[PDB]
Design a protein around this ligand. Structure first.
Ligand code: HEM
Ligand code: HEM
Ligand SMILES: CNCCN(C)c1cc(C#N)cc(CCc2cc(C)cc(N)n2)c1
Ligand SMILES: CNCCN(C)c1cc(C#N)cc(CCc2cc(C)cc(N)n2)c1
Ligand SMILES: C[C@H](O)[C@H](O)[C@H]1CNc2nc(N)[nH]c(=O)c2N1
Ligand SMILES: C[C@H](O)[C@H](O)[C@H]1CNc2nc(N)[nH]c(=O)c2N1
Ligand SMILES: [Cl-]
Ligand SMILES: [Cl-]
Ligand SMILES: [Zn+2]
Lengths: 408, 413
């Protein structure tokens, strides 16, 4: 059927037909919605998926049913028959990577989807090779503060025993340390990964913001450690425009948000190492990274310095401290000319993106639970936007952490 | 369906196990191919439709009072069955009515206030026959629930649907709400959400004061007759003027709100029976007023005015001026209610209590349907514990449901 979504603030109604193209599962049923659950080959399986993808690629360049289209399908089936897999053309790799971003329901940044620099790293054979390609990625994307979106794609999965994996969850992240007194120094989210680096021989500085080394696995081999050259790691000291004491907190963060633990799926092929990066929305750092109880958890300290009454929850001291922190982050990146987008501007762009996608594509799959910012929700336009979530392919998918699978 | 579904809390690592979903009764709107979890809204019952719905409910009731399979259980089933056969409907016992109302609340997946579910005063108004009768019942409800600021949750239940042409309806969406007036110049005075209902009231003969916070009259429909207008005695309407603990100027904005949140346009379903007039009330979470009523662009929309008074830089979005003002408004709301001793709960307290409630429900009941999109507060989401709590949404009965606005369906006499 045609499905309608309404914006309750503008009364704008859009009509979705795109969802008819989905074949993957959402997780829900007629009886139970799992919308807030975070995580809900063979030659025979392979070809239909390959066909579907090649078909949609040749449709997007308006040469569906052409000789080139027919030739490519033939080429792909013969190759699947004779090698149990196939290789994407360069044009296909690029199309597929941009579309995995376009289809990413949880991403508020998609208005940028077609501007993505794609680095083909499918000729990589060793962890040193991967280090080289990742360094080049980081340098390109960083671009002295004028951040550019990019993805680097390493060889696809074959038998599952020769996987390329970036073990880091992000290319740039800070270590976290368990203390004797059972507290956590640095980023608690990365304590386990940090411990693995230590055991593999990384020498920790044991500070609050130690940039982790890259831990890189090529062709199913044991992973190897590499230090990203520091001149490639752009960082912003966080200060506040009015509270001169804020800088005294010693807070900083990295300019480049780069997800490196997801799996890119295109036409049945699985790219288990595909680090991708953009630029930050302020709340990612200022709300989640800094203020999650299980993260840097800085509300209490900031509220102290603001001299707030912290005895009752109904003083909203946490809410007040939260806003100031996010003001500082935006102000700091802006002052250092490092690309960043605030949650008002970002969500406004997403609504415009949604309207574009309905108009040119017949829909836009979107996960309200993830799209709405973790602060000030209903004063952003997305809060009031009904969204439909469905899974389109090519896609980015979660995959198991490699330490829970790898045999050394 | 899988017998056991697990939910995780991403902050605490606590994992809970749901089995209650196996009792799911109706549609969510989702499918395996599409999720409609952010969609706001995704001819009577026949004898043969009614029989199993009633039995399902009666069984659940007798199971709750630990008399399942009892002689009393079997006799109730038989009496209900005979009634449906000789009349095409049945009447609930007072005990069942009370149980059903409490459970509709217990099952309301969009409600963060459910820790309170078993403490609900139930007023049985099924003997009511006229709009004047409805007014009397509603006045008594408001007075009881208001309790001079020490609010008490309550519901008043009017006669169930029969043929569908004799519905009891409260045309108001809330028992207490402010009027909205559209001006020739396109501006709106009062609450823009209630312009349509206000116009209806005026057409029925209400004389509007045409102010910014005019309490609307009750427009009450009994037995499918044309609705009738009544003025709630003002002494029954408790209000709170909003002031701020720091900003002396805040009171000069002239804001106030009503103390009693009371929903009156929903339908209560128990055992296949339909109570189309069942106004219920509790007490406010501050953000309902401070974020939604006051700061929605399409409501009172006071952010700019407040920001200017705060002398914020309103030139870039990145200054977070809106976010800053929003917090101060919500501080004012909580402060003003607590100062006037009117029950109110802040969003931190409410969500923390909800998490404790949900965990208790998982352990004593096997689950707790919850709508994350609705449960998570409209400000500061991720610093409340519900943001990090995976939830499962499904429909249990008895339940509160949406129903069409009565002006779209009413057959004018
Ligand atoms: C260019 C600026 C971008 C912005 C401002 C942005 C913004 C965001 C935000 C705020 C989230 C939620 C993150 C979280 O809460 O964990 C997200 C998620 C996501 N983004 Fe984007 N993004 C950008 C670029 C990209 C690019 C270049 C890609 C891939 C090519 C991408 C793919 C994804 C995916 C797959 C998710 C879901 C991640 C998950 O499920 O954990 N984004 N983005
Ligand atoms: C006692 C204090 C209570 C609190 C703090 C509370 C809190 C809330 C809040 C914040 C919402 C979201 C409202 C909105 O955004 O429109 C809500 C929705 C709801 N509440 Fe509760 N509530 C309370 C009492 C009750 C009672 C007594 C009932 C029924 C007997 C009830 C049933 C519902 C239902 C059915 C919804 C969904 C409303 C809709 O779909 O529009 N609540 N509640
Ligand atoms: C899981 N969400 C909460 C923690 N946050 C905010 C978070 C954790 C990790 C990791 N690992 C990574 C991110 C980055 C998400 C992202 C990706 C891209 C391409 C751009 C962007 N602005 N954000 C965000
Ligand atoms: C529709 N959601 C946002 C508008 N809000 C906040 C809103 C609109 C109407 C109406 N009509 C009614 C409410 C009250 C909901 C409610 C009910 C009860 C029993 C308690 C409580 N705290 N809130 C809230
Ligand atoms: C339980 C819930 O699914 C979980 O906390 C989600 C909620 N929404 C989110 N939204 C974003 N953008 N990022 C997240 O990590 C989460 N976490
Ligand atoms: C489009 C979306 O479903 C809509 O804006 C919802 C979001 N969550 C909500 N949550 C609550 N408590 N109240 C609401 O009115 C809404 N509105
Ligand atoms: Cl952006
Ligand atoms: Cl409460
Ligand atoms: Zn769903």
């Amino acid at each position: 059927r045609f499905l309608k979504v309404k914006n309750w603030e503008t009364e704008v109604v859009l009509t979705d037909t795109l969802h008819l193209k989905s074949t993957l599962e959402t997780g829900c049923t007629e009886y139970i919605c799992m919308g807030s659950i975070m995580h809900p080959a063979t030659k025979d399986q392979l070809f239909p998926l390959a066909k579907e993808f090649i078909d949609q690629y040749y449709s997007s360049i308006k040469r569906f049913g052409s000789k080139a289209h027919m030739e490519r399908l033939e080429e792909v089936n013969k190759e699947i028959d004779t090698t149990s897999t196939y290789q994407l053309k360069d044009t296909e790799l690029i199309y597929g990577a941009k579309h995995a971003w376009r289809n990413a329901s949880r991403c508020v940044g998609r208005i940028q989807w077609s501007k993505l620099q794609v680095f083909d790293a499918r000729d990589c054979t060793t962890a040193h090779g991967m280090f080289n390609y990742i360094c080049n990625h980081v340098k390109y994307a960083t671009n002295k503060g004028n951040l550019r979106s990019a993805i680097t794609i390493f060889p696809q999965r074959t038998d599952g025993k020769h996987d390329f994996r970036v073990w880091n969850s992000q290319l740039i992240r800070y270590a976290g340390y368990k203390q004797p007194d059972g507290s956590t120094l640095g980023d608690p989210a990365n304590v386990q990964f940090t411990e693995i680096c230590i055991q593999q021989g990384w020498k920790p500085p044991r500070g609050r913001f130690d940039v982790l080394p890259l831990l890189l696995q090529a062709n199913g081999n044991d992973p190897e450690l590499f230090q990203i050259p520091p001149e490639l790691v752009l960082e912003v000291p966080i200060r506040h425009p009015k509270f001169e004491w804020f800088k005294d907190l010693g807070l900083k963060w990295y300019g480049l948000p780069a997800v490196s633990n997801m799996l890119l799926e295109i036409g049945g092929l699985e790219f288990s190492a595909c680090p991708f990066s953009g630029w930050y929305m302020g709340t990612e750092i200022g709300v989640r990274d800094y203020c999650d109880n299980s993260r840097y958890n800085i509300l209490e300290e900031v509220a102290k310095k603001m001299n707030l009454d912290m005895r009752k929850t109904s003083s909203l001291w946490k809410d007040q401290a939260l806003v100031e922190i996010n003001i500082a982050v935006l102000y700091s990146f802006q002052s250092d000319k490092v690309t960043i987008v605030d949650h008002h501007s970002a969500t406004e762009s997403f609504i415009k993106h949604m309207e574009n996608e309905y108009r040119c594509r017949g829909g836009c799959p979107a996960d309200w639970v993830w799209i709405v910012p973790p602060m000030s929700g209903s004063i952003t336009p997305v809060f009031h936007q009904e969204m439909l979530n469905y899974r389109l392919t090519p896609s980015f998918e979660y995959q198991p952490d490699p330490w829970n699978t790898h045999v050394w």
